Amino acid sequence: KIKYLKSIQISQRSVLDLELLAVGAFTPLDRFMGEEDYRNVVESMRLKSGTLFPIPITLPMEKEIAKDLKEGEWIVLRDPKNVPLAIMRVEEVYKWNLEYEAKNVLGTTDPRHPLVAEMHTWGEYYISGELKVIQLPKYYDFPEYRKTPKQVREEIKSLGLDKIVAFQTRNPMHRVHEELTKRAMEKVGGGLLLHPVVGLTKPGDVDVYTRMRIYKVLYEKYYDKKKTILAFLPLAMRMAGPREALWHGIIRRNYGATHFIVGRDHASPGKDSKGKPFYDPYEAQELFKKYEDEIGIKMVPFEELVYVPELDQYVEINEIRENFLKQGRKLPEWFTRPEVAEILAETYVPKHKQGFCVWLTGLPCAGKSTIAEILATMLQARGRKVTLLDGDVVRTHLSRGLGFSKEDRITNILRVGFVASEIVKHNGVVICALVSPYRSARNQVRNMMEEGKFIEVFVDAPVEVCEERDVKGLYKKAKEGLIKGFTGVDDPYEPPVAPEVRVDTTKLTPEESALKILEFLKKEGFIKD
Amino acid sequence: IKYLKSIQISQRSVLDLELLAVGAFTPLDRFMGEEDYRNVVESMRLKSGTLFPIPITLPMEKEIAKDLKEGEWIVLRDPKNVPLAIMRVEEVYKWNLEYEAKNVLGTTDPRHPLVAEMHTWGEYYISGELKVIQLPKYYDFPEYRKTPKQVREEIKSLGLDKIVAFQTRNPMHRVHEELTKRAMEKVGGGLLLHPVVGLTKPGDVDVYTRMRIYKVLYEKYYDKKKTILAFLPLAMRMAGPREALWHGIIRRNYGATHFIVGRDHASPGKDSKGKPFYDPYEAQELFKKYEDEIGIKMVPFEELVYVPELDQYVEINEIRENFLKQGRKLPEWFTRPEVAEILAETYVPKHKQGFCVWLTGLPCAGKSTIAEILATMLQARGRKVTLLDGDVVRTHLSRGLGFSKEDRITNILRVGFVASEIVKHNGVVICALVSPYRSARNQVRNMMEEGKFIEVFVDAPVEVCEERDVKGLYKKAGFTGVDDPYEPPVAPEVRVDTTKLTPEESALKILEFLKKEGFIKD
Numbered sequence A: 001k002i003k004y005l006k007s008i009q010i011s012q013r014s015v016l017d018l019e020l021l022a023v024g025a026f027t028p029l030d031r032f033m034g035e036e037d038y039r040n041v042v043e044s045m046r047l048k049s050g051t052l053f054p055i056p057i058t059l060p061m062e063k064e065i066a067k068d069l070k071e072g073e074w075i076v077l078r079d080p081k082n083v084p085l086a087i088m089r090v091e092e093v094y095k096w097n098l099e100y101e102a103k104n105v106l107g108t109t110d111p112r113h114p115l116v117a118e119m120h121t122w123g124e125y126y127i128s129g130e131l132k133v134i135q136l137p138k139y140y141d142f143p144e145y146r147k148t149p150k151q152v153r154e155e156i157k158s159l160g161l162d163k164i165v166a167f168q169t170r171n172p173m174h175r176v177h178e179e180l181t182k183r184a185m186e187k188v189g190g191g192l193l194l195h196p197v198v199g200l201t202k203p204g205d206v207d208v209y210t211r212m213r214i215y216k217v218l219y220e221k222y223y224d225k226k227k228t229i230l231a232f233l234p235l236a237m238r239m240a241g242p243r244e245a246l247w248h249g250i251i252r253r254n255y256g257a258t259h260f261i262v263g264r265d266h267a268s269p270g271k272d273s274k275g276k277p278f279y280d281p282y283e284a285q286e287l288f289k290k291y292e293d294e295i296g297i298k299m300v301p302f303e304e305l306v307y308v309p310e311l312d313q314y315v316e317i318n319e320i321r322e323n324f325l326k327q328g329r330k331l332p333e334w335f336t337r338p339e340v341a342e343i344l345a346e347t348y349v350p351k352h353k354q355g356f357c358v359w360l361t362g363l364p365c366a367g368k369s370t371i372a373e374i375l376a377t378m379l380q381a382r383g384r385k386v387t388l389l390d391g392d393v394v395r396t397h398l399s400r401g402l403g404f405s406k407e408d409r410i411t412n413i414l415r416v417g418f419v420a421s422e423i424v425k426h427n428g429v430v431i432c433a434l435v436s437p438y439r440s441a442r443n444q445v446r447n448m449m450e451e452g453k454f455i456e457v458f459v460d461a462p463v464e465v466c467e468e469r470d471v472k473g474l475y476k477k478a479k480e481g482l483i484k485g486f487t488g489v490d491d492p493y494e495p496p497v498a499p500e501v502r503v504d505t506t507k508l509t510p511e512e513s514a515l516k517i518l519e520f521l522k523k524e525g526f527i528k529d
Numbered sequence B: 001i002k003y004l005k006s007i008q009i010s011q012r013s014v015l016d017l018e019l020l021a022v023g024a025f026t027p028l029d030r031f032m033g034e035e036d037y038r039n040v041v042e043s044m045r046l047k048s049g050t051l052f053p054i055p056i057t058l059p060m061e062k063e064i065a066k067d068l069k070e071g072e073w074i075v076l077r078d079p080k081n082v083p084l085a086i087m088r089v090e091e092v093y094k095w096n097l098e099y100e101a102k103n104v105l106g107t108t109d110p111r112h113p114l115v116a117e118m119h120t121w122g123e124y125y126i127s128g129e130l131k132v133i134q135l136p137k138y139y140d141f142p143e144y145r146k147t148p149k150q151v152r153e154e155i156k157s158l159g160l161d162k163i164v165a166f167q168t169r170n171p172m173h174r175v176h177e178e179l180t181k182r183a184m185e186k187v188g189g190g191l192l193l194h195p196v197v198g199l200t201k202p203g204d205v206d207v208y209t210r211m212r213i214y215k216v217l218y219e220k221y222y223d224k225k226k227t228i229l230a231f232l233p234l235a236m237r238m239a240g241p242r243e244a245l246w247h248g249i250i251r252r253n254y255g256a257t258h259f260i261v262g263r264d265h266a267s268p269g270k271d272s273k274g275k276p277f278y279d280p281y282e283a284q285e286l287f288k289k290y291e292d293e294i295g296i297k298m299v300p301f302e303e304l305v306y307v308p309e310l311d312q313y314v315e316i317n318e319i320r321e322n323f324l325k326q327g328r329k330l331p332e333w334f335t336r337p338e339v340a341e342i343l344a345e346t347y348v349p350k351h352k353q354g355f356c357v358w359l360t361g362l363p364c365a366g367k368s369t370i371a372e373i374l375a376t377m378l379q380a381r382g383r384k385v386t387l388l389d390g391d392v393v394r395t396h397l398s399r400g401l402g403f404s405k406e407d408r409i410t411n412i413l414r415v416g417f418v419a420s421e422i423v424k425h426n427g428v429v430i431c432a433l434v435s436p437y438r439s440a441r442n443q444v445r446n447m448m449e450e451g452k453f454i455e456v457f458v459d460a461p462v463e464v465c466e467e468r469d470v471k472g473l474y475k476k477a478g479f480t481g482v483d484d485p486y487e488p489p490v491a492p493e494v495r496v497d498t499t500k501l502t503p504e505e506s507a508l509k510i511l512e513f514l515k516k517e518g519f520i521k522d
């Protein structure tokens, strides 16, 4: 009977924290932290009780909603799509300090830290109270592998395993990670819990679907199923290095792990705005060993493993993939399993198989359509499917119902841009040939596509070239548009301030202009020919 | 030319005009007058007696033809309004489709691609003196687009006194390469590979893929001292035997001394009753009766079959398109590796092919919920998805459109247009609109290749909004199911009753169908 209750929509981070609270992943915790537990966790990595818990888990609340919360009231925690997940009694509402929390938990207040930057968007108050679960978030990707602590413990049981090593990861797994985990099994003498994070990791990680597919194919094809469990963890990482390493240990223990792998640079976001590493490479191993007994999970530590061609094996240092994922290509068998490399190659296609939008902007009769047509032909002759969005196509399929106000014309540009950006998403080539006079509208379209995939072409011509180029009477009226045709005046054309290609049409034939766009496309690697 | 009337001609007529202008149809130099036309139709001859087996005429819609003045000069412009020639209006006459189709083609069956196109031709033919302004200009492989003069010059530069020509409208596999190189050895001269890049047959491999195939195959496998590659901008008629003779005339005008005529030469296949339009060797027999008069020797081949136990093609002694649209990889005994990879570039495996899931049904039926779930399932399987749901469509696509029947149709056609372009690039697009009008959804289907539009009927009762609506429009009320009626699909690919299936189960059922067709290999 939640319909009478006040509702709040919570962040994607809070949905994940709520989910893990509800399934017992954070045991002993069963609710968001109140003020006393919070402040002791921040200062000492301990709940008020004295139980170790290194990472604060709180529910932020904007001060405009906090102001009207009432002690003892039940509220509905709803997800970003408004689905009700839990009700919460509001027992505590308290102010937190960003820099104190960041400094103590993360070791830094540098906003280059992904979590520091995020904390600036968090509501100014934290709230706490008893939770009643309505439902868990529902997933439609790989629900077979999304297992609760209870399901994983019951699976360890079924396989007859007494010892289990857990592997944390937020990254695709290569053959170094495969060796890492398998050495760890043999060493501890138990099975293995592959436990990748699918909730929130670090901005700019490989997308979750690609990663999940990687973990799935690698588990099913390369691991012994009597000794190995795969399970997806809906964790919202803090990227808090050593403190998060400890946290991982507690979580994996609640899933039934007796052992936990910690390698080099565990749970670290890298380096700060000074270039200084956020954590020492083995600071996490260090803290973990100090607490491993109290937590009740044994650390299986690794020094940085390296590949030795002479041995064709991965050894400890005592004895990256930046040319491949970019415009480059498939990783070799000794670095990555073929099935994983193939999945990566589907996601990260070479630059000459990537989509891009050639946007041709300029004055009426500048020659946009002619150049577009020619370039489309040249591109198709090179094996590329092309969508050509010129005046006629756009006015037929996209423009109907729009007027000729500035707004309607910006709408039209943005419409063409949305369509072009969806085609680029699917690795298609789009050529757009519109006057598109408004610079901001065009900038907006650039912002719809991945960086480098918007080729803005400035088709430069003199003012009122139409007649010179034998476009007169009603044909010129058609080119100029309604306002200009009837009044003799229009909004000024706003040229691309820094286009990819500039084409001076008084100097180049439309074929030469088209060839110029082509040479840019080869230069960037969009065409190998 | 600014004082003259202008008319836009068809793509077919642009190509006929190009070939008239470069002398490919010599002795013809204009579109046919009524006397020439009738004697060509009836007896494969110009009024003068000169052999010409295929009519070349210029169709004009009845309303324009009526306003033409005897003896006047007009400008002939292409579909993009570029002026190619002026023509004097010396004749304007009606033609008869049944007359022309039955005599020239042997049939009036609309299954014949030309018969079907002829029903779109203007009802009058025009003829008179031509003065060329400019030839069509191309920007694909201009180096291989060669006039009769140029091919005849290149023949001399190679010092070849005999040249066998090869007609094709298809990719060349090893069978064709062996067919051409054997023809060449029989004749003892050179080879002119003369593929058609103008108009062929609907459903043919697109011209760009084909040209790239001819170019790589010629560049890496043919002896340059005896092989010429030239692209022919012919608008084929698919007229079998009669077209064979025509090809002979044309290739002779390019300098060919010999012409390959294989099985079923220039045939479009079978009619509506599943019968071949022409007999397999009728073209070879007709050609043999006129070859001396034409002045080009036929090099006939019996049908070449591949015999695995020899690794050789033999003429029977002592199809493929159905696996291109499936993205199957061709074996090295059948195709050269470079051709196989060009075809694989354009014809991707089925599980990588683009498709459109179009969820139609009443408001609150659950189209958006189902589409969102399906999107996730598809993304998890490694397909990027464009989701054209209500909110995406309303923000980006349908602003400025209202709720009138016209605007609702316009909106269905617009989302359909967008989906079709995504599909063209092998993307997955899920659309979730009421889209109540059946004719409009059918128009959207026709924007895509057969098998690529998955129409899903999300079947819920009319009053399902009672328990499901949150926005409040059903309570407040052009509403579909209440004011303006919904037209359900006659044969959707998938149907989901939503009073029985959960949104997850509905999406799972769509997944199942996509797996069955092979669009999703999990």
Ligand SMILES: Nc1ncnc2c1ncn2[C@@H]1O[C@H](COP(=O)(O)OP(=O)(O)O)[C@@H](O)[C@H]1O
Residues within 6 Å of the ligand: A168, A169, A170, A171, A176, A177, A180, A261, A262, A263, A264, A265, A266, A267, A268, A302, A303, A304, A305, A306
């Ligand atoms: N080359 C390596 N040598 C040793 N340990 C490694 C190596 N690469 C990764 N690891 C360890 O394996 C796990 C994989 O973690 P990863 O997904 O890269 O980031 P995170 O530590 O943030 O989960 C971590 O415990 C890490 O310390």
Ligand SMILES: Nc1ncnc2c1ncn2[C@@H]1O[C@H](COP(=O)(O)OP(=O)(O)O)[C@@H](O)[C@H]1O
Residues within 6 Å of the ligand: A362, A363, A364, A365, A366, A367, A368, A369, A370, A371, A433, A469, A471, A479, A505, A506, A508, A509, A510
């Ligand atoms: N650089 C140029 N020099 C001479 N004529 C040109 C040039 N560019 C275009 N034209 C001609 O001007 C006319 C208008 O060109 P078009 O491509 O339609 O311009 P837009 O699409 O910018 O309105 C066409 O007939 C075209 O052939």
Ligand SMILES: Nc1ncnc2c1ncn2[C@@H]1O[C@H](COP(=O)(O)OP(=O)(O)O)[C@@H](O)[C@H]1O
Residues within 6 Å of the ligand: B167, B168, B169, B170, B175, B179, B260, B261, B262, B263, B264, B265, B266, B267, B301, B302, B303, B304, B305
């Ligand atoms: N297996 C085969 N055996 C003999 N001749 C063939 C075979 N396949 C194609 N041909 C011949 O090769 C030429 C090109 O065939 P095709 O590409 O269908 O073009 P068209 O439709 O113009 O005949 C034609 O002369 C045809 O008869």
Ligand SMILES: Nc1ncnc2c1ncn2[C@@H]1O[C@H](COP(=O)(O)OP(=O)(O)O)[C@@H](O)[C@H]1O
Residues within 6 Å of the ligand: B361, B362, B363, B364, B365, B366, B367, B368, B369, B370, B390, B432, B468, B469, B498, B499, B500, B501, B502, B503
């Ligand atoms: N069995 C069901 N099938 C589809 N939708 C359902 C079902 N049961 C409840 N609903 C709800 O109906 C509401 C409206 O659904 P929506 O997907 O927006 O419909 P549409 O997009 O067809 O207008 C949603 O909140 C959805 O969860």
